[PDB]
Design an enzyme around this catalytic site. Structure first.
Site, PDB file in Angstrom:
ATOM      1  N   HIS A  27       0.794  -1.219   0.000  1.00  0.00           N
ATOM      2  CA  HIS A  27       0.000   0.000   0.000  1.00  0.00           C
ATOM      3  C   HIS A  27       0.831   1.278   0.000  1.00  0.00           C
ATOM      4  O   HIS A  27       0.262   2.352  -0.209  1.00  0.00           O
ATOM      5  CB  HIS A  27      -1.039  -0.005   1.130  1.00  0.00           C
ATOM      6  CG  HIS A  27      -0.469   0.210   2.498  1.00  0.00           C
ATOM      7  ND1 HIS A  27      -0.129  -0.834   3.328  1.00  0.00           N
ATOM      8  CD2 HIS A  27      -0.225   1.344   3.201  1.00  0.00           C
ATOM      9  CE1 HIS A  27       0.334  -0.352   4.472  1.00  0.00           C
ATOM     10  NE2 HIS A  27       0.281   0.967   4.421  1.00  0.00           N
ATOM     11  N   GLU A  51      -0.147  -7.798   0.736  1.00  0.00           N
ATOM     12  CA  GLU A  51       0.485  -6.561   1.196  1.00  0.00           C
ATOM     13  C   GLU A  51       2.003  -6.633   1.290  1.00  0.00           C
ATOM     14  O   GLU A  51       2.629  -5.693   1.794  1.00  0.00           O
ATOM     15  CB  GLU A  51      -0.139  -5.983   2.470  1.00  0.00           C
ATOM     16  CG  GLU A  51      -1.450  -5.230   2.206  1.00  0.00           C
ATOM     17  CD  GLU A  51      -1.224  -3.982   1.359  1.00  0.00           C
ATOM     18  OE1 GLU A  51      -1.888  -3.806   0.310  1.00  0.00           O
ATOM     19  OE2 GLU A  51      -0.367  -3.174   1.747  1.00  0.00           O
ATOM     20  N   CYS A 134       5.112   2.743   7.450  1.00  0.00           N
ATOM     21  CA  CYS A 134       4.967   1.439   6.836  1.00  0.00           C
ATOM     22  C   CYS A 134       6.075   1.156   5.830  1.00  0.00           C
ATOM     23  O   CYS A 134       6.669   2.060   5.239  1.00  0.00           O
ATOM     24  CB  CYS A 134       3.609   1.300   6.167  1.00  0.00           C
ATOM     25  SG  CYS A 134       2.330   0.800   7.333  1.00  0.00           S
TER      26      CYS A 134
END
Ligand SMILES: *[C@@H](O)[C@@H]1CCC(=O)NCCCCC[C@@H](c2cccc(Cl)c2)OC(=O)N[C@@H](CC(C)C)C(=O)N1
Ligand SMILES: [Cl-]
Ligand SMILES: [Cl-]
Length: 166
Positions: A27, A51, A134
């Site tokens: 993402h 992911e 992230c």
């Protein structure tokens, strides 16, 4: 040199496993682009699922680095460090105790990975709990050989984390 592998990428970070292999969380990856890091898409083998994103470049992109071991998660109970950087380049590791593998739907996306629990400083800095964190790698030490086993994908407002695993 370990920390020089952690590289700002898209809306987060990713990690150079070797001169040709870069991993991140899906993402954070830019979309609608013709290249990554200046390399044409024709010269990158891209695998994305659950992911976890892996880029394998045909050219040596980070020749300053050695190759290290990439594993698809780690055993339940392993203590990892999440190698979070912030925009200054500051080095802010997060210690985590890892749990079981599973697939979890988080904000519409299926994350295949491992939940874990964080081991007051972290909270003061929202470490792991802002979008820009992230993609940071989960690593553990095997002797003095470092193993990367996932990328930071999710964490609760306030002390569970999830790393995506291949
Ligand atoms: C990195 O993009 C970011 C890190 C986690 C973060 O920023 N947390 C603060 C916002 C928390 C929102 C809730 C969490 C959540 C929901 C359910 C279970 C769990 Cl363990 C966590 O949402 C996320 O962590 N969602 C992440 C993006 C998804 C598409 C995977 C996220 O914000 N990751
Ligand atoms: Cl290194
Ligand atoms: Cl999905």
């Amino acid at each position: 040199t370990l920390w020089s592998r952690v590289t700002k990428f898209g809306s987060g970070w990713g990690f150079w496993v070797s001169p040709t292999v870069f991993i991140t969380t899906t993402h954070v990856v830019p979309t609608g682009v013709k290249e990554f890091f200046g390399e044409p898409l024709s010269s990158i083998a891209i695998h994305q699922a659950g992911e976890f994103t892996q880029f394998r470049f045909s050219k040596k992109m980070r020749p300053d680095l050695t190759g290290m071991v990439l594993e698809e998660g780690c055993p339940e109970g392993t203590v990892c460090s999440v190698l979070i950087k912030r925009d200054s380049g500051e080095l802010l590791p997060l210690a985590v105790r890892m749990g079981a593998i599973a697939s979890m739907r988080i904000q519409g996306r299926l994350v295949h990975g491992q939940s874990g629990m964080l081991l007051a400083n972290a909270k003061g800095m929202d470490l792991g709990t802002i979008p820009g964190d992230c993609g940071a790698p989960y690593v553990h030490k095997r002797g003095n050989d470092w193993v990367v086993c996932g990328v930071h994908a999710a964490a609760t407002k306030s002390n569970t984390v999830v790393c995506a695993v291949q």
